Symmetry: D2
Subunit: 334 residues, 4 copies
């Protein structure tokens, strides 16, 4: 129903497209990148991580054709020249990784779009949303440049909400053992982050992440209570959050796990999942939820310090949340 | 000086041999495994992780020949038939991973050996030692079967000692992002640990670890105060400990790092190192210390909760410790 | 229809099971290995390479329960103690890798089975078969221990057959860049093959193979005309055959590709596939054919020397051929 | 002795610098890239592939300092603004990968350099040289823009030269199982080569190469007789050439290997090496020769077709040849 445009047809852009194919309320009519339709069509059809696309993909001129529908292909590195308005695109998914600042993301609006969903932490955005945690704060009148946060924040926020509401978080620190991404390097190349400059598939690479602090954007009561880091490892996809927190109320491992499972089957169903099986990262590839508690790893000391481990497919889960958010925003009127 | 025997010439067995080559007080005269001299010689010379052995290696009958010296090669599945006594072996490094129970390791003594160093956490051992933390507790009269702990415990114990002495640890939890080992599997094979049964180079694999609790064996004051887990990832060597602890005293990042650096230069030099460089795991391959603080990763919340990250070459660092313990024990008289 | 038993429920054993679920004429009633049902059930449900099994899987005593059907689980190290006859098993898939010699494989016959399919090159087998090339040579009265050859031979033979019939092969050499298998080692460990003793995920590992020679077993006119080698690389599954051959007739890339495409759509449909897409190994994961020509890689030099490259999912393709062979053998009467 | 400048301080650029440190007649006075001195210093000190640099490395202002000597650091995207003349640089190693066309590489000359060594196959170069094969063809008065070919051609040419001179090559095909390089992609991303656009550490990736045809540039008699391809695999460094050729003479494996060893000990010592050890790629990391025969892999079929396999550290071997070439060129007069 709602016309959607994707800017930056990369890992998130393409997987967002795959997810959109499963939602009748969202119609992707155009994509933009820095290559030709032949290239984007080939990358969309064949995926090194998610397999062959379950749909008919071809090229007509320099446009894509998916299951009978033609998708307009653009190649403008300056978002201001996208002319979204001319093709009736109301919502733009900004997933290039280069326009997270409002001054750049807003160019889509200058170009005729109505709403912009930045697929990452942003700067000067109207509001940062994590589905299942604060989409209720979205205001169609005052919100036009929206951030869907990072995949890590979408993993953490959902269960941090449960823990705080049920037991109260005094403070905590997290570490995300994360798969490498396209922001890393193949073989020691110059990079702003001297850690990310190192061969991505050869080492455990400690790096930064504002995911823990970003939680306060969707859960203001946790402001200043969480901190964290990341460790990029030699896997192509799927990551895991490791939170150690000091709780206000005294608890047992069983109480913590019950609260999480209750939320997973209730209020956060589809967003937060709960697993009691001894699985590994590959088993979560293709998972659409934002966070899956690894219940076997939950532990507690003195009934006050707890460790919660949660899995997340940083590509598929997040992409699904982008599409969910677009439908949500659309349902509130454009 | 002292004559050493190595049972299980594997990853730790061979790397202990490399370490011993640089120590004059230690003399390896025999090694045991389940193959021939040709194979062990080949494996000793060419290492996929630590490169070509910087020494002359050849074979002569059932003996290895390194830099002129000859090392006897045995192939007894049952350590009871090793006849250590006959060849004057005083200290036996038990590194097969099959004889961690005291009743089994003791077979070496029955075979004529003086002491036995189990290269791993043990069961019913006379005592567990972590060099630089509690070797002063070793008693030559009563300690015959000693455990040198796990590489992970050797990385954690040292800096946990400093944090407790200077600030006092109330409670804490750790996670070690650890390289895969030979106890894991190439492609989904039966394993007592259903996580470790999965393809090791394809996933982030959570698995239990008794390292956090094992710290109590070398630091009784921390009994019941720590706990943790492990996450095996697609790297061949080098691991890292991530500790989040609640302290008794209030601190700042600067204070924590300052105290860690001081210990690295003083009491724990050669055991604990300190780094202000933004390095990755490959950079630590070949490191001889047991623990190296990644100072740039240190963080604190409310001045009470701290995170400390420390690197360790689970093969090289641990192997050196094994030799240090061998020399130490020997210095107390056999 | 025909009752089948699987000895060695590993990579091939379990994937053969998956293929069997898709063939109504094959009923797997029991499997044997060296572990418990819980472990086998877990490995069958979650696969690091092919994903979650799309079937209901549970355990009942010593039986697996797949889609309501009961599958007996044995744990007999000695094939002679399997008692296949007692449970009406007529065909046994020998996939442990330990019994490729006829004298050993025949132990299944001693235990009551009627036919034994060795899932690999064998010694003194009654006959070696490659579906699509020589199943017509199977003799129900004289062939009881049959080899289904290697995955590599199943990949090469089909297109070698086309090249020979259409252009005539004088002689040729092949190299198969192959994914690592459980016959290799995680980290430098003892192995009869000193190349395979080295860390599998860290190097390109040359290793011998009789796959090219084995072609003569299914295509006698190529006896003494082919030979080759293998190179194991750090990929979990999917391999590719690289054949360079001297032809009797002058040819061009187009003529070679056209003849290959013609056979893939005709006589070898389902066994041999043809692709003009610029794909990579991950794209072939799950492919059920024995051989897929990478048409873009076809080359010819000086008119008479050709290079043909073909892909094969060494697990899925082969496993499907095993089941195909079991159905064919059965159709001939037991 | 000769002042050298490096344009593109990447994998080849930095490894050439390492080789230079060991050659008294070569002096790198300046390097140019697209970042700062601190970033380049960090990358020079810590190498994910070749370990830490064994030398003192620091920064002083906008320059590097190695073992007391200062190295000027430039950050000019346009080689024409390098002012090589103003600092006495006579030979420029062009290793950015963007200026392989003579018109572009010639800009270094316009900037005051006397000779330009393109570290790769080139277009319209005055001449292409492979040390040990045709440096004698270098004419100091007519050759200013010189190509040192690719690492693959430097591996192939030396033994192709031996096989042709001894037995005569009618025609042949090669495949190089090559480690991934910085020209590939971490995860699926747009690329002019749709194969190279795929996750580099996840697949076996077929791709083109002109190495086989390029041999004609250094060995004219082989013009039109050789062709080949490449297969990029999940390893960070070290590659291997696999050549299959039809010979004019009937030969034996022992005859081929003996001829190769003879050239390795004489005519091509230091360029071509010979090994009878069953090694793997990791074992060749750091190797400085251009090509090492894997004697155990040599194979002959039907007397006239041979397969020769040779290893090469595509980073170290080639980098040493670049330095050897600069020295040679210098000895002919600037
Ligand atoms: N990959 C993950 O795990 C993950 C998860 C959640 C969010 N994100 C975020 O989403 C964004 C994209 O990440 P990704 O992993 O998909 O990156 P990517 O590198 O795979 O994709 C980026 C795409 O944008 C294109 N591009 C670059 N500049 C452009 C421009 N000026 N105009 C148009 N197209 C341009 C590139 O060609 C590429 O196809 C980032 O902000 C990132 O932090 C990543
Ligand atoms: N690898 C590490 O990171 C690490 C670190 C610290 C301690 N350890 C511990 O050291 C021990 C060995 O580990 P590893 O990684 O070296 O394993 P490994 O598998 O590489 O080496 C074990 C060796 O013992 C041999 N062996 C097995 N049974 C034997 C027997 N009955 N008699 C003689 N030889 C036999 C094997 O052939 C093999 O060479 C384990 O207890 C382990 O937990 C490992
Ligand atoms: N993996 C491939 O790509 C491939 C392809 C074609 C053929 N094959 C062949 O198939 C065979 C098996 O290979 P795989 O890769 O499945 O190996 P694997 O190691 O995954 O499976 C072997 C299984 O047999 C079990 N086993 C071993 N000894 C046993 C015994 N005595 N009794 C009962 N069970 C026992 C093991 O526990 C394991 O589950 C080999 O002959 C191999 O050459 C492998
Ligand atoms: N890596 C190998 O195995 C190998 C072997 C032999 C030859 N080569 C060749 O050497 C060249 C470089 O390859 P590499 O692997 O070192 O690449 P790389 O990507 O590691 O290094 C290229 C360097 O050039 C810099 N750069 C890019 N444009 C620049 C410009 N305009 N001005 C100044 N600096 C710039 C980059 O920042 C980078 O540091 C290529 O032509 C390649 O084909 C590579
Ligand atoms: O999941 C974590 C973030 O989404 C990673 O973003 P990146 O593209 O900067 O690596
Ligand atoms: O460093 C951690 C332990 O020493 C690992 O032991 P493992 O051999 O069981 O993997
Ligand atoms: O496909 C190749 C062979 O079937 C591999 O056999 P393996 O189990 O010895 O690796
Ligand atoms: O060794 C082969 C070539 O030198 C590789 O060049 P590349 O930088 O394009 O990967």
């Amino acid at each position: 129903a709602v016309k959607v445009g994707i800017n930056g047809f990369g890992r998130i852009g393409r997987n967002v497209f795959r997810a959109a194919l499963k939602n009748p309320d969202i119609e992707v009519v155009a994509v933009n990148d820095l290559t030709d339709a032949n290239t984007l069509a080939h990358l969309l059809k064949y995926d090194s991580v998610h397999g062959r696309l379950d749909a008919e993909v071809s090229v007509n001129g320099n446009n894509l054709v998916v299951n009978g529908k033609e998708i307009i292909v653009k190649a403008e590195r300056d978002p201001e020249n996208l002319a979204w308005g001319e093709i009736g695109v109301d919502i733009v998914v900004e997933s290039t990784g280069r326009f997270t600042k409002r001054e750049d993301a807003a160019k889509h609006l200058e170009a005729g779009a109505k709403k912009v969903i930045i697929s990452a932490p942003a700067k000067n955005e109207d509001i940062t949303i994590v589905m299942g945690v604060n989409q209720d704060k979205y205001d169609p009148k005052a919100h036009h440049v929206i951030s869907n946060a990072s995949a890590t924040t979408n993993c953490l926020a959902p269960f941090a909400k449960v823990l705080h509401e049920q037991f109260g978080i005094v403070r905590g620190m997290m570490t995300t053992v994360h798969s490498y991404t396209n922001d890393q390097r193949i073989l020691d190349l110059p990079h702003k982050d001297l850690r990310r400059a190192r061969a991505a598939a050869e080492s455990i690479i400690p790096t930064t992440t504002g995911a823990a602090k970003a939680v306060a954007l969707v859960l203001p009561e946790l402001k200043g209570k969480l901190n964290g880091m990341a460790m990029r490892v030699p896997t192509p996809n799927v990551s895991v959050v490791d939170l150690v927190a000091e709780l206000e109320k005294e608890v047992t491992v069983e109480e913590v796990n019950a609260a999480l499972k209750a939320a997973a089957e209730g209020e956060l169903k589809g967003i937060l999942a709960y697993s009691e099986e001894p699985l590994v990262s590959r088993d979560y590839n293709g998972s659409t939820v934002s966070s899956t508690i690894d219940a076997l790893s939950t532990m507690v000391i003195d009934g006050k310090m707890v460790k919660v481990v949660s899995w997340y497919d940083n590509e598929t889960g997040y992409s699904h949340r982008v599409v969910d958010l677009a439908a949500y925003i659309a349902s509130k009127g454009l």
